[PDB]
Amino acid sequence: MLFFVDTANIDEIREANELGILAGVTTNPSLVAKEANVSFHDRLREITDVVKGSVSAEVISLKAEEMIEEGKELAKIAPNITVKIPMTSDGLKAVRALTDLGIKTNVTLIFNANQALLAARAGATYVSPFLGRLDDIGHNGLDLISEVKQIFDIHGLDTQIIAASIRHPQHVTEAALRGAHIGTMPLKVIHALTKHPLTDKGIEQFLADWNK
Amino acid sequence: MLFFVDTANIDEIREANELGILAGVTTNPSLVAKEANVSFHDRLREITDVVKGSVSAEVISLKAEEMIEEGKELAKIAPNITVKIPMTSDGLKAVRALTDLGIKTNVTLIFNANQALLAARAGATYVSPFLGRLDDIGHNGLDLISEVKQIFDIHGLDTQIIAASIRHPQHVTEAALRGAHIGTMPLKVIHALTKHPLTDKGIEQFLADWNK
Amino acid sequence: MLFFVDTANIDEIREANELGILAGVTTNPSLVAKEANVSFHDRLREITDVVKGSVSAEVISLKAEEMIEEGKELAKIAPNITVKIPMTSDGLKAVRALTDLGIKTNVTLIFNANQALLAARAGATYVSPFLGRLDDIGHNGLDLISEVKQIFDIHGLDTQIIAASIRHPQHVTEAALRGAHIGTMPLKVIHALTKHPLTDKGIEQFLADWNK
Amino acid sequence: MLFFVDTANIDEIREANELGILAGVTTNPSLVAKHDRLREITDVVKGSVSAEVISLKAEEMIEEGKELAKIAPNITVKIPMTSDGLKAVRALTDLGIKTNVTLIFNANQALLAARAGATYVSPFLGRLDDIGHNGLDLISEVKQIFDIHGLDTQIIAASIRHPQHVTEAALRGAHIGTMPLKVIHALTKHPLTDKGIEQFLADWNK
Amino acid sequence: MLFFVDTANIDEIREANELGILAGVTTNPSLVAKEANVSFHDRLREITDVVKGSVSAEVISLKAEEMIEEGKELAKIAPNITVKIPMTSDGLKAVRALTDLGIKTNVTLIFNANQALLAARAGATYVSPFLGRLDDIGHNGLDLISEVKQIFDIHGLDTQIIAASIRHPQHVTEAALRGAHIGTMPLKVIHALTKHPLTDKGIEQFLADWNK
Amino acid sequence: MLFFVDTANIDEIREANELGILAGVTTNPSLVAKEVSFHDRLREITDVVKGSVSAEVISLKAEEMIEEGKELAKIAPNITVKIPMTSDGLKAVRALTDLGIKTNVTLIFNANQALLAARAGATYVSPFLGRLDDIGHNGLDLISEVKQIFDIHGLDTQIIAASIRHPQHVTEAALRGAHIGTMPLKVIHALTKHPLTDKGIEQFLADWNK
Amino acid sequence: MLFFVDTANIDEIREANELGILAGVTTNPSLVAKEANVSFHDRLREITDVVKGSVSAEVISLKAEEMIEEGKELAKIAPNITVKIPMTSDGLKAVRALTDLGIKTNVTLIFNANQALLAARAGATYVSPFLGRLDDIGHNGLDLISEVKQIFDIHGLDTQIIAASIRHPQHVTEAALRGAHIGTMPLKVIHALTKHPLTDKGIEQFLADWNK
Amino acid sequence: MLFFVDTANIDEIREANELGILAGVTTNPSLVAKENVSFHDRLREITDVVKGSVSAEVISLKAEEMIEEGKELAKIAPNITVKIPMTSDGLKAVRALTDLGIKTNVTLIFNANQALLAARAGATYVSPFLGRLDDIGHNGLDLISEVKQIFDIHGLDTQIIAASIRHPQHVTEAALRGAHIGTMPLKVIHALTKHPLTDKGIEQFLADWNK
Amino acid sequence: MLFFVDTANIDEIREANELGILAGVTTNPSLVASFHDRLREITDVVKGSVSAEVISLKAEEMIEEGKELAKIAPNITVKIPMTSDGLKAVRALTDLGIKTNVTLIFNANQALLAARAGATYVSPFLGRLDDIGHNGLDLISEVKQIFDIHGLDTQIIAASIRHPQHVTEAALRGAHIGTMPLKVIHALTKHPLTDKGIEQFLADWNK
């Protein structure tokens, strides 16, 4: 499973890229809105200068015509820009139009397999099921990844799954075992993944033995 | 799984096509008869003008020779016309005869795997098992999809499954997971598939954060 | 699984009772509201005169103190009145208070196992998971029945499960297999459960052979 | 699984009873066409003896059932799976009369019948098999429902066509299987039983 | 799974062929002997005139040398003649000799997987396990199909399985699901496979709705 | 699973009984013929073994089988009458059961036969593992089927796994729920053996002895 | 599964108790240390005045003899006091000593099944496996619940499992399904368990229909 | 699963008992041999401290002599359990001792056939050897699963002692698979108490408590 | 599953190689405790991967050490500990075409990070996990499933092998390689029925 970082903070992105592990970035309106005094499109230019993989940027309008125009504009920023579109009927129309223009798309706010399959059949490059948000209301988000992977595999769809709303390390292992192509997560989750107490003990012992 | 719309209403078909999601259409004698003031063959011309994928049109006669002549007539309307034939002995004769002339066929009113295998071995391009009608008399329609998929896979048949008599969103996910190539459904079902309360809530939150 | 009828219509209730199959009744504010010229309390009197089993009547206030007073008033009507309480924090308060007074409760609008368990632990006599409403937003309602039955069995809870939002005959067979104690359904579903085409054919053949 | 015999032919019933295996009998309007007979049968057989009503109207079914019940304690009234049938089953049950609901082809019907008070339910294996639905799977469903819910309703596997139905019905938990006498005799046979008897006798005789 | 008809009756064979479903024919000495006043070799000539697929014709001698001569004689009748050999030691010798000549063989009277594998390893084009005859002596005939499929798949054998002694529709679906390449059955079974009460009802409702 | 010894040899039976492991004995016409009077042999055996001792009738006619079984039953109270799986055998079993005489229905090769025998009143049914194995049908699976049937339906009928050829039949019969396994003495002795047992005895002894 | 609240905050505990769902309380040294200006023992008196169920209070010393003395003192405060003992060798000695004196114990900081079994065999009333902390270092905490339940059931142990380090709603349903006797969780998690968007929507619709 | 300690060492047995966890003791001829004290005197000391089953092994391989040795051992204390090797003479000794009301533990068991024979001779315990099977490429834990299934299905009250326990993984698996008892060295018992998050948890608790 | 010998003892390595079975060698700083001369000797004898561990914990220094190690022979594989700096080093070394083996891996999250940094090999520790009550063999199963599903060419080295049961299970679960002491390798050859069979064959053959 590939690692994307789920943030609009440029320093966090640089740190993740420097780890040697970074395949992509996801931003959303809330993540962008929490960053102080910088232009959205200028920020995207900075991110795409650093990260060569997919960089998701979300449209603001809810109207298909306006989403399509926003998407064409976003796509001009850099070749690796992916246009994030919400799961709505108008969103499906925008995904189809953008796909016809050769512009990559990522349909977000996906909470079930029916939504994922619609998005895939509209032409989506990526679909983004939300794990944590489902978990919190008593439905297993990880089970959605399994469903979507089984559907895409059986039917020969090239659509790629981004596991989103990742809260903790248990989501990461399970998303990978269940076949999510990509997991997008906060920087703090990425750092948690490096750690184990026996790694800490092993390093100390190796070095103690080495140094007389 | 591909989305077909199960209707003869032209307005509904145009709406479905505008979603960017439509791979085909199925009509049947009941669906056609409920529409007012237009010729069956003229309606088919309008539909095939809009939809590039398979469009099913059902024969009226129960006699093989008449079914074949009806099918040859229907095939002249457009290249994407698929001839719907009922699962009977005469039907199997019609399917073989039409297949010998290069005409695509969809065998309908299938309720078990023996019927589906017969239709496939007669040359059927598609088979249409009925989910809801089976569910209502206490047999699991979705289990039929599983049986036919396994038979076609093991034996190397290129026959395509159209899950028909789709009544609700739970039929759609399950049919896709079980390997139905196509699902044909009312427009109302298609619109239902786009919706989830957390999608609504997510849009609202993204927009509130974006706007100061 | 026991059969409850999910209606406030007295004629429907009398008909279901006359089948010889009826173990109880569920009403709710929507079902009561659609019924014409009769008092809620008068209607409950008539229903409890006909049906000896549990009869659910729902409170209207969302404040615990007021719910408790409504529940006390409802309980005076007949010994088989069960007080229906919506799944909220105030609802749990009301369930505990009413349980302490010896009054039976039915916690409604349950959509996950976390809610079902909280309700069970507040003292609920019944819990009512909603099958159809879950199915429609792409989560399997029947799987919730399985979760709740497993929890109640493993932990020795006497809480009873009412499978609600039953839409069709496939919900009935599955809820029964999965261990719902009770299924509440519209009268029309109950009638559909009696029917099978080989029953019709068997009756006709037995009579043809018997009559010369 | 108990063995019932599915016939109205008295010679076959006596023959089956003589094997030491017979736990009851089922008749039906088709088997009959080809009250005194019921008296004869219930003198020979101690277990449940099913006799089917003729009317399709609840009130008339109930009267017929009351009359049938006077013949012997082990008379079981066979009622078809209809709405009127359910009414009849409840009335008869309230009078302490045993019932067997027939023409059952799914688990919804079996459950309704059980909840109306039926002593027995009779799912039809072969008739389902022939239209492409697995009759044996219906046994599995009904057994699971009855066990989970603590129902004392008994399953009679009916429309048994062959020995494979018998083993599977038993494995899946049918309380009873009803079958023609022919099927019962076929169950006794195996080529290695024949060969083993011959070899035992050859060795024994020098 | 392919449909073969298991008969030596020429009218039945022509009727089966007319359905559009017929991939081949199996005769055997008992099926041939019940047909009146026509020679065995003349009957085979009539059958192979009608049916283009494999037509099985069984040898009478039990001695390998005589089987091989009978088989060379049968092979001259038509290119689609397949030589039926009983499962015996001398049978295996005959299968190997005929296979070396390029003549197709079908080993019959198979009741276990040891026999099926021996036949396959001698060169047999087809093996014919007998379902019904096993069922009657208390062994599951369908399980033998599962064993032979599993063995042939794992080991890369091109040997084909003909499910024989088919008695009813339940044998057909199960043999197909379990991987029998071919099922050979009586014509009466083939007709039964077309039938379902909801197909009948569906045809009636379509016509009712179509005719005002 | 209980151990029965499947032999008519009195010396073998005494040796099996001395091991501390013997719950019963099965004889049959072939085992008896290979060896003294039959009924005198049965007296000797039932003097040594307190558990069930199976003795097979010779006639194939039910009335005659019943008379033979009544005579056999007088020999000792632990005598069990072995009846072959035929239609007359079922008649014989029901009659003998009504008279309180224990029975063991033999030459069982499928679950339909075993269920018939059980419903006729059989104390024991004897499926034949090895003979089924050799014609390509898994004998052990028959044990699994009969155990499931008897368990689900509350039958007290006991299963004797017969035609046991080797140690592998023994472990599997026990895991699958045969109440009893009847086997030759040579099989019983093979069951005691393992190379790591031999090795462990040597090692325990060497360490104990300085 | 029973609900315990995992906090030393008296206001939070009172609020939880008011829901009608509270079966006990767990405190620990970190949880008590974060509460300002009240003594440990006075706080325990306040808690045990409100809560009738098990209230866990953790010893401070790591020496067995001192743990035993601290436990004896703690148990005098109220009959429902349960002495929390860390999983160490000295801890096991304290557990057995306290068990012999009829004092209830809860062995904490359990991270594997070997520790849980040792604790159980020393006489522990409760064991507390830590879900979240295991999850964070890449080991499935919920699988530990499954192992300990299996061991306790197979071997007839009356030891009770408290699922601890509960982070979110997905831990609660899974711990219940897997057989944890008790879950102890922060107040914020308990309130999240009450909520679902279809519960919200259902309340609105009921009231709309009820009010004309 | 109950904990037994697999040692003849008196100091180790006392330490184990002091943990509050000890349900019994197994000695064997190799374990006793590695200790300057009389064997029967040691058994008295052990059984004075430990109430549960204490296993002591016979030396002779001859049935008659095993029986005489067992009767002598049984007089030492009520909780003495006579350890007998899995052999034909062993089965004879188990049946004879069982008839006298004396407890037995059949040792050197490496398959389910041996375990069943021993159970049917009247054995109180059977001791399958995990580690020794593992080392020759056969899964010792699977033997526990087999023996437990057999005893459960057939209503046998025979108890399983998982022996040749080498490491903590044997302990959790033997317990999951239904071994009534596991016998192990004291070192293994102390290893079972340890986990790095337990260490870290303690440190954090005390850090927060002390300002 | 390929056999590697987990030792820095040159005598043990030559014996293992002489068995006909050896696909590689792992050293580590404990096992090792002139290093580079020994590595030259080992890589002359063994054609397959030979793992040598870096000493520094700082990324820049690990990279320089790795570049130096790589000059010794084509089959040198640089062993790097699972830390943030280690991931940086793995990516740099991978970009230079140098093979890497990430060690001290105890969960599937670590294994996946390592794979995505470019690691040639990842080394999960079986015995060390087993001892703290977590099933080391289940980690092999997880990593194999992740690598297969996602098309990763990363190879698994099952490390901290303690006994023959670890070997069979590691192979069944899909570990590409198992590294173990020579003692364990010789133990794998043995079975009492092999001993008995040889004796019986020879007795029959000699009259």
UniProtKB/Swiss-Prot annotation, chain D:
* PROSITE patterns per UniProt: TRANSALDOLASE_1, TRANSALDOLASE_2
List the pathway annotation. Carbohydrate degradation; pentose phosphate pathway; D-glyceraldehyde 3-phosphate and beta-D-fructose 6-phosphate from D-ribose 5-phosphate and D-xylulose 5-phosphate (non-oxidative stage): step 2/3
Q: Which GO terms describe its biological process?
A: carbohydrate metabolic process; pentose-phosphate shunt
Q: Which residues form the signal peptide?
A: none
Similarity section: Belongs to the transaldolase family. Type 3B subfamily.
What is the protein name stated in its UniProt record? Transaldolase
| Alphabetical keyword list | Cytoplasm, Pentose shunt, Phosphoprotein, Schiff base, Transferase
InterPro entries in the record: Aldolase_TIM, TAL/FSA, Transaldolase_3B, Transaldolase_3B/F6P_aldolase, Transaldolase_AS, TSA/FSA_arc/bac
**Its Gene Ontology molecular function terms?**
aldehyde-lyase activity; identical protein binding; transaldolase activity
PTM comment text: Phosphorylated during sporulation.
Question: What EC number(s) does the entry state?
Answer: 2.2.1.2
Name the catalysed reactions. D-sedoheptulose 7-phosphate + D-glyceraldehyde 3-phosphate = D-erythrose 4-phosphate + beta-D-fructose 6-phosphate
GO cellular component: a single term: cytoplasm
Task: State where the protein is found.
Answer: Cytoplasm
Which residues constitute the catalytic centre? 78 (schiff-base intermediate with substrate)
Q: Which CDD domains match?
A: Transaldolase_FSA
Specify the domain of life of the species encoding this protein.
Bacteria
Kindly report the protein's main subcellular placement as a broad class: cytoplasm
Question: What HAMAP family does the record point to?
Answer: Transaldolase_3b
Biological role: Transaldolase is important for the balance of metabolites in the pentose-phosphate pathway. Does not show fructose-6-P aldolase activity.
What organism is the protein native to? Bacillus subtilis (strain 168)
